[PDB]
Write a protein that binds this ligand. Sequence first.
Ligand SMILES: [Mg+2]
Length: 568
Amino acid sequence: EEWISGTYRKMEEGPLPLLTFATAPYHDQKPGTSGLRKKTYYFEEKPCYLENFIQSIFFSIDLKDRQGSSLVVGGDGRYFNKSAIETIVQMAAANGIGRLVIGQNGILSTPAVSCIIRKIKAIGGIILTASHNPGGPNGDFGIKFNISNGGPAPEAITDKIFQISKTIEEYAVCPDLKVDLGVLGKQQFDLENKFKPFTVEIVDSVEAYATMLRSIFDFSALKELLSGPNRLKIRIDAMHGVVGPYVKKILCEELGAPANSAVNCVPLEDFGGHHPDPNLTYAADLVETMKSGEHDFGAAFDGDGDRNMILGKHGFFVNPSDSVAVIAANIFSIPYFQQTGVRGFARSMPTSGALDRVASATKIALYETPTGWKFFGNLMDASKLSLCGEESFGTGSDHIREKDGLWAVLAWLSILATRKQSVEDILKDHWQKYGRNFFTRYDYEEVEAEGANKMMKDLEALMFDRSFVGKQFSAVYTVEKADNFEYSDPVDGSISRNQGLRLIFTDGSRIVFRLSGATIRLYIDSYEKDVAKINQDPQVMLAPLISIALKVSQLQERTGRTAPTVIT
Ligand SMILES: [Mg+2]
């Protein structure tokens, strides 16, 4: 009681052997921009799948950077996360790793992982999350690998991991290692044929991240905002995800918002049986409570805590493409940007051009990148990007090399405290100053692939016809440009094409198609400036361009979908 018995037993067992076991390679462990996600039974039931991938990650690191180095390990709290973390501890011990900094019970949000990596000078980190995907025995499981800068491994590293995993023959593991992920503090293990002991530091999940955020924002003004008598009634929905504890400690305990403010803030291994995705579909409960009109501010997070959804009173949903534009138009309400200044704005291409309005009003440069973190991090490490956001509920700054949902919530709270206006009023002022960029996005999830790819090809060849550019459509829009978006990275000279079908109208409106069973994504972004037509239902003002997109793409006849699975 407590560490005593474990220490005496550790001494009685003596040094723990390190053994090499044979394995057969899999041919589908190809990690993308968001790590490697399969079904949970892939990692739980398939023999040596997890061991093969983890050993491939270790083999992807040079031996000179592996020996005494520190590696952050943490997840969002999914089913099977704990046992896989234990396997990571054993294999990491056998692969000669200096120390593993793990959050208590394996709980560390992706922004927290980036923060700790950049703080303790770690070689990297392994994040056990599938982000917004569902979790559980019949759900999805994912493994991300971040490097020493705090961000996800670039394509060369994730590659090398994949090519190694296709040919892996054996792995090293310390099977008799038993670590208690539940108790904070340091735990060392004597390894056989090794003189130096292996170290596992179980750290508080929230402490470091909360300290960083305490340096980013003015926690005093947030105290006066969330904890006072005249307090801003907030309703934060963590969707049973990783951010719950952070909401409890940061927003509720430290900043003083009472416990009523948080909901679904206890991480569950199945996320309560729902998709931890913050949008108008999977987070409809939050919008339905926001319909009551008692709360002035609402927000939702995803599985690993890099997404955020922002709602105002009576469910005044603000789209991410707009939200980043409001954060940029009021960027000096945050002390961090006061200290650093604004080096640049950036958005994913399918994001609405609302950010370009504040980027052109001020003269801070704006970079339009494809979907994915590689380009945002590329511009961040060159001191060219200060605030970024993507339509996929992505908002973040250069404080870390991952996007951060709770950071965006604290930024919005800072803007509300500074301006002393409601969310809706602030966005009305924004829409009148810059002109509203009506934005919508339709998600047709898991349609069969061949028909979707054939639609994108036939449609693509329809754009490529010179008789298309110029031709008009009635409600009246005129086609100006039509291409498949490509991007030349200004940092490393990288190229990336087939990033989405872009249709630019002389009106400034854009219709974008993208393909992710396969999921079809429809992005629609029109601009409007005259004051008599900026306060309407966006579905109605956008219905023309939606009809043009569905009719030109012939999507329903080729997919049988009647309505999109998700609306934004
Ligand atoms: Mg996520």
